[PDB]
From a paper:
Titin is a protein expressed in the skeletal and cardiac, or striated, muscle of vertebrates that plays various roles in muscle structure and function. Encoded by the gene TTN, titin spans half a sarcomere (the basic contractile unit of muscle) and has various functions including preventing sarcomere over-extension (Gautel and Djinović-Carugo, 2016), acting as a molecular ruler for thick filament formation and as a hub for numerous signalling molecules (Kruger and Linke, 2011, Linke and Hamdani, 2014). Fn3 domains are only found in the A-band region of titin, where they are arranged with Ig domains in a pattern termed super-repeats, which themselves are repeated. Fn3 domains have a characteristic beta sandwich fold, with a core of hydrophobic residues as the “filling” between two beta sheets that pack against each other face-to-face.
Fn3-3 and Fn3-11 are found in the non-repetitive region of A-band titin near the tip of the thick filament, Fn3-20 is in the second D-zone super-repeat and Fn3-49, Fn3-56, Fn3-85 and Fn3-90 are located in the 1st, 2nd, 6th and 7th C-zone super-repeats, respectively. Structural predictions of the three variant domains suggest little change to the backbone trace of the proteins and that no clashes would be introduced upon mutation. All domains with variants from HCM patients were solubly expressed in bacteria (data not shown), however Fn3-11 Ala16872Pro was unfolded as evidenced by 1D NMR and its decrease in elution volume (and increased hydrodynamic radius) compared to WT in size exclusion chromatography. We also characterised the effects of three further rare missense variants found in patients with HCM: Fn3-11 Ala16872Pro renders its domain unfolded (contrary to the predicted domain structure) but is still solubly expressed in bacteria, whilst Fn3-85 Ser27083Pro and Fn3-90 Arg27839Gln do not affect the folding of their domain but reduce its thermal stability. The negative effects of Ala16872Pro on Fn3-11 are easier to rationalise as it renders the domain unfolded, though soluble. For two variants identified in congenital myopathy patients, we have previously shown that missense variants that render the domain misfolded and insoluble when expressed in bacteria also do the same when expressed in cardiac and skeletal cells, giving no reason to suggest expressing Fn3-11Ala16872Pro in mammalian cells would “rescue” folding of the domain via chaperone-mediated folding.
Residue numbers in the entry: 1 to 103
The structure:
């Protein structure tokens, strides 16, 4: 009965990882808040820090993403995803399981 950013993406999980990539997938927000979801953003943070960094250049128009930018081999990360609509940016998803950039 009002207009808001979307609720957060759901069910974020890691599908694959390597020394140079972390592949993730998620499910759409339960609610779009009153205007369609137009994109997703992925953030990455080395575990034990609060140094969240956006790892996509353009809005993601899919429910999966291969993270490559800024991945450091043998570092350990968590990820989170945000949804965007014409009102603004969602709070982030629940964070991912911990993932090491190794094979």
């Amino acid at each position: 009965g009002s207009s808001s950013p979307p609720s957060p993406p759901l069910d974020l999980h890691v599908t694959d990882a390597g020394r140079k990539h972390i592949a993730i997938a998620w499910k759409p927000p339960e609610k779009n808040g009153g205007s369609p979801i137009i994109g997703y953003h992925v953030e990455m943070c080395p575990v034990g820090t609060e140094k969240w960094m956006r790892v996509n250049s353009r809005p993601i128009k899919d429910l999966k993403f291969k993270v490559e930018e800024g991945v450091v081999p043998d570092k350990e990360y968590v990820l989170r995803v945000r949804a965007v609509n014409a009102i603004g940016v969602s709070e982030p998803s629940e964070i991912s399981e911990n993932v090491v950039a190794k094979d």
